[PDB]
Swiss-Prot record:
Subunit structure: Component of the CSN complex, composed of COPS1/GPS1, COPS2, COPS3, COPS4, COPS5, COPS6, COPS7 (COPS7A or COPS7B), COPS8 and COPS9 isoform 1. In the complex, it probably interacts directly with COPS1, COPS4, COPS5, COPS6 and COPS7 (COPS7A or COPS7B). Specifically interacts with the ligand binding domain of the thyroid receptor (TR). Does not require the presence of thyroid hormone for its interaction. Interacts with CUL1 and CUL2. Interacts with IRF8/ICSBP1 and with nuclear receptors NR2F1 and NR0B1. Interacts with NIF3L1.
GO cellular component: COP9 signalosome; cytoplasm; cytosol; nucleoplasm; nucleus
Main location: cytoplasm
Region entry Mediates interaction with NIF3L1, spans: 1-235
Gene Ontology biological process terms in this record: inner cell mass cell proliferation; negative regulation of transcription by RNA polymerase II; neuron differentiation; protein deneddylation; protein neddylation; protein phosphorylation; regulation of protein neddylation; signal transduction
Subcellular location as annotated: Cytoplasm; Nucleus
PTM comment text: Phosphorylated by CK2 and PKD kinases.
Similarity remark: Belongs to the CSN2 family.
Residues of the full protein shown: 30 to 276 of 443
Gene name per UniProt: COPS2
Keyword Phosphoprotein: yes
Record function comment: Essential component of the COP9 signalosome complex (CSN), a complex involved in various cellular and developmental processes. The CSN complex is an essential regulator of the ubiquitin (Ubl) conjugation pathway by mediating the deneddylation of the cullin subunits of SCF-type E3 ligase complexes, leading to decrease the Ubl ligase activity of SCF-type complexes such as SCF, CSA or DDB2. The complex is also involved in phosphorylation of p53/TP53, c-jun/JUN, IkappaBalpha/NFKBIA, ITPK1 and IRF8/ICSBP, possibly via its association with CK2 and PKD kinases.
The protein's name in its UniProt record: COP9 signalosome complex subunit 2
Length: 236
């Protein structure tokens, strides 16, 4: 039944040059869409060539065409892996000034209650891009959504909150957040985050006057920064 579409997708996959190949992928899409997993794969390749060579708004258009096979046609797992890989390619190639908008459209299209890690990790990395952008207004909305997703990951949300208030320079809030973050640390995996909050916890203890607790905090933070790497290792 799908014997044709498979072959035309595989035929358009070759060619090397995007000249005439993109129109062939468009012909694969123009076969009446009935499945349509092969149209998704055709557009996925179209995306893979578009941001890598020349024009970007066309990539945004074809990515918006990709964001229709999330719930219907193609399964959530294959779409998750495809979006993740595509986002990694753009992150390695170009910077925030294009990537942030694609992250935003991805989160705008993923309006689904069953999205657990799919919503979270995208919103978290967008939060990091919004930290690099020097935006703190909409970052609070992002952090509101991330905090309300639970009320492992909560410590990440607390680490982003602390990262925001480190630039905002609100000491009392950072003290409250660290004292709240100590509760979640009891049953948790082993990432870098555990040593990030501790750095602030050290500085806070220097602000209050407790130098021994600051010493232990900076020692354990330095151990975590030794396990991950520099630039914060030397400063810690």
């Amino acid at each position: 039944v799908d014997l044709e579409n498979q072959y035309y997708n595989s035929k358009a996959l070759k060619e090397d040059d995007p000249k005439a190949a993109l129109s062939s992928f468009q012909k694969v899409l123009e076969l009446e869409g009935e499945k349509g997993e092969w149209g998704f794969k055709a557009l996925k390749q179209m995306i893979k060539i578009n941001f890598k060579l020349t024009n970007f708004p066309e990539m945004m258009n074809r990515y918006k065409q990709l964001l229709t096979y999330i719930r219907s046609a193609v399964t959530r797992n294959y779409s998750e892996k495809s979006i993740n890989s595509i986002l990694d390619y753009i992150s390695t190639s170009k910077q925030m000034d294009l990537l942030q908008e694609f992250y935003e459209t991805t989160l705008e299209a993923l309006k689904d209650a069953k999205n657990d890690r799919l919503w979270f990790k995208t919103n978290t990395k967008l939060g990091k891009l919004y930290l690099e952008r020097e935006e703190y207004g909409k970052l609070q909305k992002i952090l509101r959504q991330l905090h309300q997703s639970c009320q492992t990951q909560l410590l990440e949300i607390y680490a982003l909150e602390i990262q925001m208030y480190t630039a905002q320079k609100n000491n009392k809030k950072l003290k409250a957040l660290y004292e709240q973050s100590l509760h979640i640390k009891s049953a948790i995996p082993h990432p870098l985050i555990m040593g990030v909050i501790r750095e602030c916890g050290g500085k806070m203890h220097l602000r209050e006057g407790e130098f021994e607790k600051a010493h232990t905090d900076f020692f354990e933070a330095f151990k975590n920064y030794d396990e991950s790497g520099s630039p914060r290792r030397t400063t810690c």
